[PDB]
Amino acid sequence: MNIFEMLRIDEGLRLKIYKDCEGYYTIGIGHLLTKSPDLNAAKSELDKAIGRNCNGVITKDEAEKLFNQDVDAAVRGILRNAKLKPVYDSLDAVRRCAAINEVFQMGVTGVAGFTNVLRMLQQKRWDEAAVNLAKSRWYNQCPDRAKRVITTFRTGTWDAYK
């Protein structure tokens, strides 16, 4: 399937501000607003992100706008980065989707910092890559959101998303 359908499965779609698995205010398809516990701080961040007064609720179209922006940032982020690009180019199509997903979740610097996993992916050591991914705070702090990505790195199929 495509990266948008994949991330919708991992992140869900919620049109009002909610607390994610880690307790952080999130909206749309995995759009992180703030790590502050102050709901009013999340509302302010949301208003800045959209450019209007949202009172904690957005439209599906606005959610999709944020989602587009966020996926675009992940893709452009990989493709200009001296560590991430050669690995992305080396991967098969399905694992490339898993790469974009991981970057959307963790950010460029977070992914680029996992130098071992990158080498393992570049070297086709899929099982090793997954075991190591399962030691991260990324996975351990929120397993349900990361589990299918890890499995996808292990198998190179869409099976976890069917």
Query: Determination technique for this PDB entry?
Result: X-ray
Neighbours of 159 (CB within 10 A): 12
> In this structure, is the dihedral angle defined by the CA atoms of residues 80, 81, 82 and 87, taken in order, positive or negative?
negative
First to last CA, the chain: 9
Here the tokens at position 41 are 């701080």
Q: Map residue 143 onto helix, strand or coil.
A: helix
Quote the CA–CA distance of 2 and 75 in Å, as a whole number: 13
To the query of whether residue 92 is one of the catalytic residues in this protein, the response is no
- Which residue of the set 20, 47, 64, 70 is catalytic? 20
User: How many alpha carbons lie under 13 Å from residue 102 in its C-beta half-sphere?
Assistant: 34
* Nearest CA among 81, 68, 66 for reference residue 26: 66
Here the tokens at position 19 are 């607390």
Number of domains within the chain: 1
Vertex 62 angle, CA 56 and 63, to 5°: 80
To the query of whether residue 159 is one of the catalytic residues in this protein, the response is no
E strand spans, 50-99: none
SS3 per-residue string spanning 89-139: HHCCHHHHHHHHHHHHHHCHHHHHHCHHHHHHHHCCCHHHHHHHHCCCHHH
- Which amino acid, residue 146? A
User: Could you identify the residue written with the tokens 């990505």?
Assistant: 149
Residue span of the structural domain in which 48 resides: 1-162
Residue 161 has what DSSP assignment?
A: G
Alpha carbon of residue 70 to chain centroid: 9
* Nearest CA among 108, 68, 69 for reference residue 88: 108
- Which residue of the set 10, 11, 45, 62 is catalytic? 11
- CATH at residue 150: 1.10.530.40
Rg for the chain (alpha carbons), in Å?
16
Neighbours of 140 (CB within 10 A): 10
Secondary structure (DSSP) of 23-37: S-EEEETTEEEES-S
